[PDB]
Design a protein around this ligand. Structure first.
Ligand SMILES: *[C@@H]1O[C@H](CO)[C@@H](O[C@@H]2O[C@H](CO)[C@@H](O)[C@H](O)[C@H]2NC(C)=O)[C@H](O)[C@H]1NC(C)=O
Ligand SMILES: *[C@@H]1O[C@H](CO)[C@@H](O[C@@H]2O[C@H](CO)[C@@H](O)[C@H](O)[C@H]2NC(C)=O)[C@H](O)[C@H]1NC(C)=O
Ligand SMILES: *[C@@H]1O[C@H](CO)[C@@H](O[C@@H]2O[C@H](CO)[C@@H](O)[C@H](O)[C@H]2NC(C)=O)[C@H](O)[C@H]1NC(C)=O
Ligand SMILES: *[C@@H]1O[C@H](CO)[C@@H](O[C@@H]2O[C@H](CO)[C@@H](O)[C@H](O)[C@H]2NC(C)=O)[C@H](O)[C@H]1NC(C)=O
Ligand SMILES: *[C@@H]1O[C@H](CO)[C@@H](O)[C@H](O)[C@H]1NC(C)=O
Ligand SMILES: *[C@@H]1O[C@H](CO)[C@@H](O)[C@H](O)[C@H]1NC(C)=O
Lengths: 426, 214, 118, 214, 426, 118
């Protein structure tokens, strides 16, 4: 009735000790040729041995972990204690308690017969003292709209405070519940005006009598529509662009403008900035977008800003949707052959490779609608260029390759192309 | 000797013996034992020496030794033998113990079928268009897990290989293809190119030589 | 004038109970909360807000920038009471919102006490 | 973490050309650049935007793009170009930057030589003696690092393989050997056995079959 | 002339924040398209990107380290400050401050052009790893010699203190300079006597004014020669064994000893310990060594013990040297031929194989000393079973294959065996 | 008899130099020394061992079988001087050896005044 029963903490903070204990009933550790030990198993991976103590007070530890592990043994109480010291979050997994027995007195090599059950051990990933300050919908705001800053943290903070740069007194103070250790607060800005722009920064604390944490990353809020001058957005290529040709959006203004912001209407990374260089009769600054792809699609708005007050803006320019489409291409049929010699093989393979086609449906049938004896048309591989390719192979009796004439027809409907190729082996 | 290597996975249809090997340098002068860990359970010892077996374990599991590797033979695999099988030994001197990586015996449905790979060299018409592609076609294999490896004169090539995922056929046997993109200068330099396919356990190779059969 | 002792006792009782006012603070208020001024709530609100230095509870910074640090009311019971009372789960409090909330609560307590004695 | 993979190491004799390729799933849309870090010093930019070199870099270095991989070729590598080479590129979204594992180009003192592998079947008189042993002999290779990997019927075999460390030879090129021990029934069971030799990446293979000679 | 000069703390504790400070001269961050960032390189590993700040208020962090980084800029006085918050002994390397430049707008991909010099950063290991205590020559000593306990650590401890349990104050204290990775003290005990038995343990610390680490595992020092009666050792088989036989050492004596020890000279491994059973008016313990190989070679001596005095052993017994070596077997030659004489080759590969032989020298010579050219003899192969193997091949021309006899003659002086086998081509 | 100022001056300089003794604390030895006991360095060793509290430098355990903790006056300069002098690469320090090494080092300082005076 030899059984092992292990128990201990099942959730330990990072860089802290673990104190699993094993209580064994059914055998006495004072008898010769016995031993208890601990064996780990990460979820899914293979087992790994950690510690072992024999009847005589001899301890073995896995050499990669000899510094951290430590096993202590008590005979009368029938208990063994494992005390792994530093617990990084890659040590999670089931921990078994085993009953090792020696083979012979020649070498301290053992086989684990009676295993335990195992206690799941989980290690906290780690906390971030810095709060995160994010704004919805976006850093660009209308002159009359109610913003909502989201100062959030995952360090169990009970209350947050919001500071605007350049002011000595805190703007607002809020609180939140440590819901499973994650906290979030939503400061509401009322009707915005010219003076609400700036660099908002939020802190955190455990309670009003504690010390405040490190400042969050500064967030910029820009007010739009303060100036009088209007800006216009003009794209040098056509509004519709085939993929590859490098778009160059251009911003023009009739006034003395310094910096031009260009924002993508959808949720994007961040607005761009550039300095305005005087041109023929207008201040302008062009953004080279480089080789466009399907990602740079959407609505683009070009603002205007001046460094007299760097957080102000002009009115948004007229939206300019940028549409990208992959042009259809005609398949090219190349003929692939077994090779010059396929001697002594009863059935040989002949085939057509259709290379570079973009609308996806292509259809290959050998010798019109006949030769349906084995035509297999393989599925198509989407090449990184963005053009698909597909192949088909017809198994044929060998002597026939000399006389029977096998040829293949491709039908790519969207590009209105029908190509036939007469494949042969020579 | 710090590593005891095992196959990553072994699959076998019912009624056929499955062989699991545990190779390591330290197995020459130390004993070994074999463990079975069914999912969501505790590992159960099977055989505790090179050859001898516990009383309760059925007659199917029998072990053998040969040189620096020990092997298990699950004679007559049944549906209740799907688990992970581990291996144990010690260091060379007799010391800190070791555990193998551990296989995973899995019972199949339809019988295993080996791939049939056909390799096609670029046509003479390829080179006029300043292009050259090698096409490797794999069909009629089961289950759907392949890994193609393109080698030029043995040395691995990973510049231009494009592989599709396995797809179902009408026969419930998967099929997949692989294409290599080559400039005409490269194809006229190396001696031979090979498309190696590795099934669950296999290595089927096909070779094409630009200078020989073109 | 029998209502005057009752009104004074009731209002000081309410203020002491709500804000965990110190025992000596009760007599300090009784020195000032004298029946000349129990009629209004703004006077007593400001009197509390300046006598018990509630303005010190909120944090402040030494420099123009610099991380905020807790004020002089680090461990005074009044600061802990107002913190646990207003800053709950989803309540905001700026510099110009605390006096208003204190006015609301104090006025409610005084009105309730007066009309319950009535 | 990082998705860009590189060969662990590349060795080349002086005067030849060395090719380094790093591949990933983000090289399709985002550019790449190549860095050179001599031991101890700080890395120096070599090639940016996949095609262009700096104005103060030797003409030997050149680069090119091949789909989802970029290759840097050191034509005529001299004794100075012994360093580590890293390629960097953004992720899919183009926000963060990812470096590569980084190779290590090393120039050999003596020109490289390829192994000469000859494999011998068991003698016709060993089947009478009920013991069968294949022999694989590797000769005249430099530098000495070979990993014999026996394969039977296309599946790996590790039960019986015995190999010696490469040893000095009278000529200044190393040598080694490897032996596989088989039961005669196993020898006559499978259809093809193959010794496989790995030497500085390149792989050579020689195969024999029981049906050709027993 | 773009230069960047990093400067900051080099040594830092295990839970403190690093604050580097780049300083760049030549370019200003207010120029469009530029940027400054930090790159980390652990000792002898690949580069890792850490943080980057563009010509804007935008900061990009490594996704897996975003929680513990903070990059800031000061454009008025050119400098960039990086702050890592929770460094571990794995976050040590050579941090670089690098220039940057955008390829083109529309994708924040950059190439770092003007790098900076190295900036070595090292983190001191905390007091969690425990020292390892080891003793030479062996844990048991005669009551006349001196012992040198060795305390080693893999964390860079500067001072070591040795504690013997049973005493109130520290027995000895010593320091060792922290060599590149390891440090080791060499506590020297005096001339031993009866009262040096017990469990010695040693701690560690970075200086004599800091928290000491976790205790080392106890080391048992046993002193022999404090009991009157003696013990004797003998082996059931003959002392000489054939490397494959059951060997069973026996310890037999008068007197009431309830614990026996068996030690092998030259090994620092822990002694074996067993209990005794009263058989035939003699106290004995039986040590099954199981199968024996060349490793179990040397001299074995027995020791008695009693439980009343845990750390006192009887006087050492007579040595009984055990010699283990395999028996000479003699070679068994076997012919080998390629069995596929392809006509498209000029040289064949005839050869002969020597399969099993234990004595190391064996020589193969072809046609009795002739054919000195074209013959190769590979080095011996040590099989797992302990018997060597050889091989020799000769490359002869294809024309020579035919009516040209080829035969290999071998010898093994220690077995007095000469065998000649003719390798006929199939 | 102009060497009796020299005898104490040399030793009070040497003790400060060797053991990094604070200037305001060096003269305390003068009260416990005179013109006949400065020849023997063991008196100086006893005075240092008694007043400067060198015993507090060494580690001490709170209760038997417990983890050592540094002594009381660990941060005092005398502990740093002892650590830099007697410890280091290839040195040992027993409980009894420390007074012995201190006395051996003070002997040379004592002999210095006799050699220099003449
Ligand atoms: C602050 O953040 C958001 C503001 O909308 C709130 O979270 C949303 O509200 C529900 C109900 O509370 C949450 O369960 C969801 O996470 C959010 N719903 C969505 C996004 O549709 C949140 O409650 C606000 N208040 C607090 C105290 O966190
Ligand atoms: C994409 O096309 C645009 C078309 O203007 C190119 O833009 C200029 O290219 C020249 C070429 O040397 C550069 O000197 C200029 O700096 C580019 N920008 C401007 C505003 O003139 C661009 O180079 C093209 N990119 C590629 C990769 O071909
Ligand atoms: C501590 O003692 C060990 C063990 O002796 C020393 O390591 C070796 O010591 C022997 C002589 O005692 C030398 O011949 C070896 O060269 C030493 N090994 C190495 C790698 O140097 C060790 O040097 C001693 N350390 C100190 C500080 O005394
Ligand atoms: C080698 O010989 C020894 C000596 O007899 C064997 O040890 C005995 O093994 C049997 C096996 O059934 C046990 O019942 C005995 O109790 C063992 N003897 C003692 C004293 O314990 C050993 O088993 C033999 N080894 C092999 C592989 O046969
Ligand atoms: C606030 O948090 C600190 C830090 O955890 C704690 O010491 C204190 O007891 C808490 N409560 C108050 C009222 O300060
Ligand atoms: C001893 O080490 C600790 C931790 O490394 C340090 O804080 C302390 O200053 C050191 N002692 C002295 C005298 O510097």
């Amino acid at each position: 009735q030899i059984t092992l029963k292990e128990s201990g903490p099942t959730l330990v903070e990072r860089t802290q000790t673990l104190t699993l204990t094993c209580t064994f009933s059914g055998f006495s550790l004072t008898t010769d040729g016995l031993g208890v030990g601990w064996i780990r198993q990460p979820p899914g991976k293979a087992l790994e041995w950690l510690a072992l103590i024999y009847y005589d007070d001899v301890r073995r530890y896995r050499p990669s972990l000899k510094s951290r592990l430590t096993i202590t043994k008590d005979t009368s109480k029938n208990r063994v204690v494992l005390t792994v010291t530093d617990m990084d979050p890659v040590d999670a997994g089931t921990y078994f308690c085993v009953h090792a027995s020696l083979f012979n007195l020649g070498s301290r090599n053992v086989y684990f017969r009676y295993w335990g059950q195992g206690t799941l051990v989980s290690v906290s990933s780690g906390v971030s003292k810095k709060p995160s300050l994010s704004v919805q919908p976006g850093p660009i705001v209308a002159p009359e709209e109610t913003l909502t800053l989201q100062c959030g943290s995952d360090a169990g903070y009970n209350r947050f405070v919001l500071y605007k740069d350049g002011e000595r007194d805190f703007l607002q103070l809020a609180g939140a519940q440590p819901q499973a250790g994650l906290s979030q607060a939503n400061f509401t800005l009322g009707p915005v005006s010219r003076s609400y722009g700036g660099q908002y920064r939020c802190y955190g604390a455990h309670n009003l009598s504690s010390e405040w944490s490190a400042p969050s990353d500064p967030l910029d809020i820009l007010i739009a529509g303060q100036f009088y001058d209007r800006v216009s957005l003009s794209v040098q290529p056509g509004p519709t662009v085939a993929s590859g040709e490098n778009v160059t959006l251009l911003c023009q203004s009739q006034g003395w403008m310094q910096t031009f912001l260009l924002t993508k209407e959808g949720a994007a990374d961040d607005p761009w900035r550039l300095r305005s260089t005087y041109q023929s009769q207008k201040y302008q600054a062009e953004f080279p977008m480089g080789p466009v792809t399907s990602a740079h699609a959407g609505t683009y708005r070009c603002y205007g800003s001046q460094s007299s007050k760097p957080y102000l803006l002009t009115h948004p320019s007229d939206p300019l949707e940028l549409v990208v489409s992959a042009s259809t291409k005609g398949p090219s049929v190349f003929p692939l052959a077994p090779c010059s010699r396929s001697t002594s093989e009863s059935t040989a393979a002949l085939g057509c490779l259709v290379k570079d086609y973009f609308p996806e449906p292509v259809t290959v049938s050998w010798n019109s609608g006949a030769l349906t004896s084995g035509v297999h048309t393989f599925p198509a591989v989407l090449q990184s260029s963005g053009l698909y390719s597909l192949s088909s192979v017809v198994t044929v009796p060998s002597s026939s390759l000399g006389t029977k004439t096998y040829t293949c027809n491709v039908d790519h409907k969207p590009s209105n192309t029908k190509v036939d190729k007469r494949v042969e082996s020579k | 000797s710090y590593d005891l290597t095992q196959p990553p996975s072994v699959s076998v249809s019912p009624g056929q013996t499955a062989r699991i090997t545990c190779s390591g340098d330290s197995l020459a002068r130390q004993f070994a034992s074999w463990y079975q860990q069914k999912p969501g359970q505790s590992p159960v010892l099977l055989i505790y020496k090179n050859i001898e077996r516990l009383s309760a374990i059925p007659e199917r599991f029998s072990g053998s030794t040969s040189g620096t590797s020990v092997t298990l033979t699950i004679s007559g695999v049944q549906a209740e033998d799907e688990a992970d099988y581990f291996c144990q030994s010690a260091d060379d001197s007799g010391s800190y113990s070791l555990f193998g990586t551990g296989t995973r015996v899995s019972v199949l449905g339809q019988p295993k079928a080996n791939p049939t790979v056909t390799l096609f060299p670029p046509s003479s018409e390829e080179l006029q268009a300043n292009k050259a592609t090698l096409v490797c076609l794999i069909s009629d294999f089961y289950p759907g897990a392949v890994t193609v490896a393109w080698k030029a004169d043995g040395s691995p090539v990973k510049a231009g290989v494009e592989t599709t995922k396995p797809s179902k056929q009408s026969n419930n046997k998967y099929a997949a293809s692989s294409y290599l993109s080559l400039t005409p200068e490269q194809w006229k330099s190396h001696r031979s190119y090979s498309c190696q396919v590795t099934h669950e356990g296999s290595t089927v190779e096909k070779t094409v030589a630009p200078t020989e059969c073109s | 004038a029998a209502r005057i002792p009752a009104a004074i006792d009731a209002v000081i009782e309410g203020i002491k109970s709500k804000f965990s006012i110190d025992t000596l603070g009760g007599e300090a208020l009784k020195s000032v909360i004298d029946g000349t001024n129990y009629y209004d709530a703004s006077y007593i609100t400001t009197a509390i807000y300046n006598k018990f230095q509630v303005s010190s509870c909120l944090p402040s910074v030494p420099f123009l920038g610099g991380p905020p640090v807790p004020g002089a009311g680090a461990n005074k019971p009044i600061c802990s009471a107002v913190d646990k009372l207003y800053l709950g789960s989803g309540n905001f409090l700026d510099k110009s919102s605390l006096p208003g909330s204190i006015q609301k609560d104090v006025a409610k307590i005084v009105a309730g006490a007066e009309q319950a004695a009535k």
